[PDB]
C-alpha cells in the first residue's frame, strides 16, 4: 500500500495476451506506481492519455487503477480511444466518452507472429448492437444477418461472429500485431490506494 511497487510488469511483460474480444482486466490496488518511466520509455508506439496530463501522473493519487490488455493490429490502435467507431470500438473494446486514463501500445510482431501465421488471436466481426463502454462479449453464437433463424449452422446470412487475425512476419506495419494496455484511473470517496512516486 506504501512499500510495494505496482505490479505493472505482470501486465506489460506478460507472456500471453488475450484476444481483443475477450480482453483481460487486472485490478491494481495498494501499491506505488512509477508512471514517468512508462511515459518516457522508448518501447511504446502509443502513449495517449485522456482526462489527465501524463507529465503530472506521478503527482496524483487514485483509489484504484485498472489495466486492460489485449492484441490488435496497428491500424486499429487508433480505435482504442473515446468517440471512435470501427470493428474494434463497436464490437470488441469501447471506451466511454469521459474516459480518464492512458492508452499504451507497442508493436509485438516478433512475439505474436508465427511462420505460417498466428491464428490464435481473434476479434468479433458482427454484432446486433455496439458495445457499451467497458463491455466484454465472449459469446460464440452464430450471427443472424437476416430474418431467418440460423439453427447453430453457418450459411447465407448466418456467420460465425469471431474472425482470426493473419499476423505473418512479412505483413505491413499496419497489419502487424500490437499489444495494448489501457490504464484507467478510478477515484472514489475512499482512501486512495495507488499513488505515484
Amino acid at each position: 500500500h506504501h512499500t510495494n511497487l505496482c505490479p505493472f510488469g505482470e501486465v506489460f511483460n506478460a507472456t500471453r495476451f488475450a484476444s481483443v474480444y475477450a480482453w483481460n482486466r487486472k485490478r491494481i490496488s495498494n501499491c506505488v506506481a512509477d508512471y514517468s518511466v512508462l511515459y518516457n520509455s522508448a518501447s511504446f508506439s502509443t502513449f495517449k492519455c485522456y482526462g489527465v496530463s501524463p507529465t503530472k501522473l506521478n503527482d496524483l493519487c487514485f483509489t484504484n487503477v485498472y489495466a486492460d490488455s489485449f492484441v490488435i493490429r496497428g491500424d486499429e490502435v487508433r480505435q482504442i480511444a473515446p468517440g471512435q467507431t470501427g470493428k474494434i470500438a463497436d464490437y470488441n473494446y469501447k471506451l466511454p466518452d469521459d474516459f480518464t486514463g492512458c492508452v499504451i501500445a507497442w508493436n509485438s510482431n516478433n512475439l505474436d507472429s508465427k511462420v505460417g501465421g498466428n491464428y490464435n488471436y481473434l476479434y468479433r466481426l458482427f454484432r446486433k448492437s455496439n458495445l457499451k463502454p467497458f463491455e466484454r462479449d465472449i459469446s460464440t453464437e452464430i450471427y443472424q444477418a437476416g430474418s431467418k433463424p440460423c439453427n447453430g449452422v453457418e450459411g447465407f446470412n448466418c456467420y460465425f461472429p469471431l474472425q482470426s487475425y493473419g499476423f505473418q512476419p512479412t505483413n505491413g506495419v499496419g497489419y502487424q500485431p500490437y499489444r495494448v494496455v489501457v490504464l484507467s484511473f478510478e477515484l472514489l470517496h475512499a482512501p486512495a490506494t495507488v499513488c505515484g512516486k
Partner: antibody
Amino acid sequence: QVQLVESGGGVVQPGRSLRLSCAASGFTFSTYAMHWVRQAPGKGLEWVAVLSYDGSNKYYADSVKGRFTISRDNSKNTLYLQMNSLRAEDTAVYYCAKGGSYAYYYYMDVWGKGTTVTVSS
Amino acid sequence: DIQLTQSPSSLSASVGDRVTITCQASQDISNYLNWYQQKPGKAPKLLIYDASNLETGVPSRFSGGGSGTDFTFTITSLQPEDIATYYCQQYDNLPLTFGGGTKVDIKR
C-alpha cells in the same frame, strides 16, 4: 467510504410482490453497474441480477428470471429490485453491490448491509 | 454456468495453524477469483481479489494463488477472529457463482 443502504425488506405473502431499494453514496452511481445478491437462511451466496450504468441492459439468474426485475433511477442515486411471484425460496437477505466501470458487470466490490425479505402468509 | 467446488466443506484448526482450502472451477477463469470471509450474522467481506492480491486492510496472513481452474486460499497463522465461513467466487462471466463455502472450526 463507499456505502450502500438497502430498504423495503419485510414480510410478504407467497405470490404477491415486493420492491427493494438500494441507496448508494461515495461514487458516481450513474456511471457504474449495479448488482443484487441474496443469501437464504443457512445457505450460500446467490447472485440475483445486474444492471448496466444507464439501465438499458439487464441480466438475471435463472432462479429469478421472469419474476424479478432490476431497475435504477440515476437522478435519485438508488437501485431497485422489483420482486414478483414470490416463493418461499426467495426468503433471504438481499444485498446490493457496486459493479464495474460502465457495462463491466463482472465486479462486485462493496456490498451493502442487507435487507431481509421473509416470504410467509 | 461456471461451477466452483470448495474443499473441504468444513475443517477444524487451532490458533497458530496454517489453514489451506481449495477451489476448483469447471472451466478456465484466468485469475478472476474472489475469496470472501463471512462471520455469522454479518455480510461477506472480500479478502482476496484477482486470485492472488490482498484487499485493502486485510491482514497479511491471508493469501491466495492459482490461475485457470485450480485455486488455493491460505491462512498462515490462524487467529481467533478468523473463525468464519469462507467462499470463493468467480467473475469470468455471468452468472457470478460462488463455492459451497468452508466453515473453519476451533479444534479442541
